[PDB]
Amino acid sequence: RSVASSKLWMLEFSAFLEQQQDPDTYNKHLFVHIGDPYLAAVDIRQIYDKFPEKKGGLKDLFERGPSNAFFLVKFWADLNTNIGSSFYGVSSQYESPENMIITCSTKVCSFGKQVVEKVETEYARYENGHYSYRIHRSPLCEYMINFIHKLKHLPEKYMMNSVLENFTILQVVTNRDTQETLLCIAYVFEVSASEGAQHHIYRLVKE
Amino acid sequence: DSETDLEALFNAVMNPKTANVPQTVPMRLRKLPDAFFKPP
Numbered sequence: 732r733s734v735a736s737s738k739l740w741m742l743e744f745s746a747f748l749e750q751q752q753d754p755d756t757y758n759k760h761l762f763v764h765i766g767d768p769y770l771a772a773v774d775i776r777q778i779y780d781k782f783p784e785k786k787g788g789l790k791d792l793f794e795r796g797p798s799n800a801f802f803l804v805k806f807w808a809d810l811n812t813n814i815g816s817s818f819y820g821v822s823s824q825y826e827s828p829e830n831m832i833i834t835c836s837t838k839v840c841s842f843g844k845q846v847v848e849k850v851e852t853e854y855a856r857y858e859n860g861h862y863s864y865r866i867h868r869s870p871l872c873e874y875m876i877n878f879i880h881k882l883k884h885l886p887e888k889y890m891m892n893s894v895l896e897n898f899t900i901l902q903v904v905t906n907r908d909t910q911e912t913l914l915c916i917a918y919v920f921e922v923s924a925s926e927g928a929q930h931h932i933y934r935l936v937k938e
Numbered sequence: 939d940s941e942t943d944l945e946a947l948f949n950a951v952m953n954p955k956t957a958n959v960p961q962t963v964p965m966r967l968r969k970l971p972d973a974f975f976k977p978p
């Protein structure tokens with residue numbers, strides 16, 4: 732269990748483009764995918780500038796804790812796909828020992844400023860001695876679809892990475908009733924060059 | 939101006955002469971883990 736606090740574990744996360752060739756034929760391209768050991772640490776102060784500030788922002792959330800709920804994911808995104816019959820989606824799955832009502836906030840940021848927020852409420856399903864939470868085929872917001880379109884129309888890979896340096900995503904999963912931070916995941920991005928998508932996962936620490 | 943201007947963000951890298959975006963410290967210059975820029 733990599734991305735896991737004491738109360739919640741994210742077992743699956745993927746962003747994808749699904750193209751319908753014909754009514755029985757679907758081609759799915761994964762942009763990014765995640766599917767007990769101790770991870771390497773990153774000083775959170777090194778990335779505060781790339782995420783929303785003020786009350787409810789990353790610093791505020793981290794200081795309120797708990798410290799074990801905070802992670803940084805570095806993605807190498809696979810942009811090699813044919814860009815009517817397209818579905819851009821995000822899917823994720825979580826497990827908890829506790830029966831909770833959870834809220835998943837996803838904030839897309841440019842130069843550390845919030846551009847768009849998507850907020851989803853999830854209820855528990857009992858499964859194999861624990862509770863499961865699934866966000867299944869959540870539509871990617873139009874900003875993201877537009878962003879990917881503009882990225883692919885860039886003629887050089889170094890241009891794509893330059894843009895991505897200032898594009899980030901902040902995912903905050905919260906217990907709806909108690910407001911406890913169950914998971915807070917900061918996402919940073921490069922383009923994959925190896926023919927696909929890869930990731931490093933880090934723990935966010937105070938220093 | 940606006941920091942969240944999508945067209946401005948892409949214009950900054952497509953046409954560097956007319957770039958109008960906040961200036962930032964490149965990630966590679968920061969105090970980050972050794973393999974942060976080396977894919978597994």
Ligand SMILES: *C(=O)CCCCCCCCCCCCC
Pocket residue numbers: 746762763808821837839847849870871872873875879900920
């Ligand atoms: C709008 O709905 C924003 C929700 C963001 C969900 C996270 C999906 C991650 C997208 C992968 C980035 C690929 C582009 C480099």
